[PDB]
Ligand binder design. Structure first.
Ligand code: ZN
Length: 66
DNA sequence: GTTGCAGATAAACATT
DNA sequence: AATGTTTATCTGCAAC
């Protein structure tokens, strides 16, 4: 259900992963983690239109073993 | 057999 | 410079 889903905390409609807040308020992957760590609302000065991207860290993965 | 969704890690950025 | 802090991307599981 991304149709109309807007981050309740920061209104962004672009998110890498949609989270759900303890209140049931849709939030973007960033607000969910920041909010969970600090549990406070922050100004939208950290937001950008599209999503930010970065070089994929080392291909570290659950690779193997058992 | 494929898709979708949720959650967690590690890296890099900013600050001091 | 190191640490603290932050966010993007990866994978897995369940159901059909
Ligand atoms: Zn948000």
């Amino acid at each position: 259900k991304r149709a109309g889903t807007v981050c309740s905390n920061c209104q962004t409609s672009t998110t890498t992963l949609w989270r759900r807040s303890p209140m049931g308020d849709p939030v973007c992957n960033a607000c969910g983690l920041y909010y969970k760590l600090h549990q406070v609302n922050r100004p939208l000065t950290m937001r950008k239109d599209g999503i930010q991207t970065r070089n994929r860290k080392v291909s570290s993965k659950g690779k193997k073993r058992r």
